[PDB]
Structures are given as C-alpha cells and as structure tokens.
Amino acid sequence: DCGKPQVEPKKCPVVGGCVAHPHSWPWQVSLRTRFGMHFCGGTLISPEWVLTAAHCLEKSPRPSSYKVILGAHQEVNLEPHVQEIEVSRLFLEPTRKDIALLKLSSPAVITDKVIPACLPSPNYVVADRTECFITGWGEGLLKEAQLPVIENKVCNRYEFLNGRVQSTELCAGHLAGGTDSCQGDAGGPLVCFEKDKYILQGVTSWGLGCARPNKPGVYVRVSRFVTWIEGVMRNN
C-alpha cells in the first residue's frame, strides 16, 4: 500500500521548516557509507527499491560502499526497530540525469514506520503553486518543509534560475528565502498529496545555494523517469 502513512504527517507551525512528526514520512531513507555516516536521503518506492540522486553515488560505483536506514526519526541513536539493509546493485540513470536506483540486498519489511511512496504517471507536470513536502536530515531529527512548486518557465527567468532548469527537473521553493532542502537532503523525496495519498514527484538534486531569496531548489522530475524505473525493476 503506497503513499499512505499509518502515522499521519503534521504541517509546520532542511533549513527552516520544522521537525517532522515521528515516522509520518515512512518512505524516507537515510543513505550511509559502509562506515555508518549519513550523507544523503532516498525514497523507498517498493520493498526492494530505493530512488536517490545519482550525485550521491559519485564517490563509489560499488554497491558495498552503501547501506540504507529505514524507519528512522533520529539520525544518530537509531531507535530499536530501525531497519538497516545493504545495497546489492546501483543503477545510474543512463542519460546523465541526477537520479539513480538502489536495489536492496533484502526487501524492507513493511510496517507502520516503513512504507513505500507512490510513483506518478509518466509525464505528469506538477502544477504551478502546488504545495508539496520535502524531508530529510541535512544542513539529528528528521525535518520537513512545505514548499510551493514554481513552474519551469517562471523558474527559468533571469530573476530566478536563468535558464538552468531542464524539462526533466522541477522547481519548488519559498522565494523570500529561509526554508529549503540542503546538502544532506540530496536524493530524498519531494512528495505531493494527491486525493488521499503521497506521490513522489521530485528527487532533491541541486540549487543555487540553499534557502536564498529567489533561488528555489531544483528536483529531478520523477514523472519523466517512471518508464525507465519500471523497466529496471522489471528486468532486475
């Protein structure tokens, strides 16, 4: 059952934002080096598959360099029931896009704290001003922020990101500054509530800094990679 947290998320009263309600984002994963240090996020999209950013894997093409922590809220002292699962294979997107799949060495156990996010339909375009959520441990409690999507044609204006955003990316952010995903959130989810569940629409990718005025974050547009993702899962 994807996209439906058993523990309901709360909105705020990651730079800025607020601490998430514990386990309300049950697809959020922490990507760690074999040494155990958190450095990137990811999203569980099925029991055996995590989606992350390709740049998070820049340091090593060896699956043994990585492990995934599922079900966590605190980053350092992992709570008793947290799942640590190794990675058996890495799949970088084949056209140098900032997205990648991790096949876990064993399927995650689905529980009230470990649940996959839903994937969008191919080529869906999140509408301008849609309020979505980003989550992560970045720049030790899991944080969230609610940010509005900014349509690419506005985001690509000189006043904002000046032609840098591709159709395979989306923009989201508060243009006054102060609230944003940042480095340790890379690879993690941008999700949007659709009808009754959360759909993974973006993968935290890059920005001109973090939380700066007129510089919204850039996310890989997951809907442009669903067909590729499905083919990798089907054939591996």
Site residues (vs ligand GGI, CB under 6 A): 55, 96, 98, 164, 166, 180-183, 185-186, 204-210, 217
Please say which residue, 18 or 208, places its beta carbon nearer to ligand GGI.
208
Choice between 114 and 218, CB closer to ligand GGI: 218
Query: Shortest distance, CB of residue 219 to ligand GGI, whole angstroms?
Result: 8
Nearer to ligand GGI, 80 or 94 (CB): 94
Least distance in angstroms from the C-beta of 228 to ligand GGI = 15
Closer of 102 and 182 to ligand GGI (Cβ): 182
Nearer to ligand GGI, 28 or 46 (CB): 28
Token match 């989306």: residue? 170
Q: Given the complex with ligand GGI, which of 105 and 183 has the nearer CB atom?
A: 183
Distance of closest approach, residue 180 Cβ to ligand GGI, in angstroms: 5
Return d(Cα 25, Cα 2) in angstroms, integer: 12
> Shortest distance, CB of residue 138 to ligand GGI, whole angstroms?
7
User: For ligand GGI, which residue has the nearest CB?
Assistant: 217
Residue 23 or 215: which CB sits closer to ligand GGI?
215
What end-to-end distance do the CA atoms of the chain give, in Å? 22
* Residues 111, 121: Cα–Cα separation, whole Å: 25
Q: Measured from the CB of residue 110, what is the shortest distance to ligand GGI in angstroms?
A: 28
3-state secondary structure the chain: CCCCCCCCCCCCCCECCEECCCCCCCCEEEEEECCCCEEEEEEEEECCEEEECHHHHCCCCCHHHEEEEECCCECCCCCCCCEEEEEEEEEECCCCCCCEEEEECCCCCCCCCCCCCECCCCCCCCCCCCEEEEEECCCCECEEEEEEEECHHHHCCCCCCCCCCCCCEEEECCCCCCCECCHHHCCCEEEEEECCEEEEEEEEEECCCCCCCCCCEEEEEHHHCHHHHHHHHHHC
Angle made by CA atoms 172, 177, 178, in degrees to the nearest 5: 105
Shortest separation between residue 124's beta carbon and ligand GGI, angstroms: 20
Rounded to a whole number of angstroms, the minimum distance from the CB of residue 201 to ligand GGI is 15
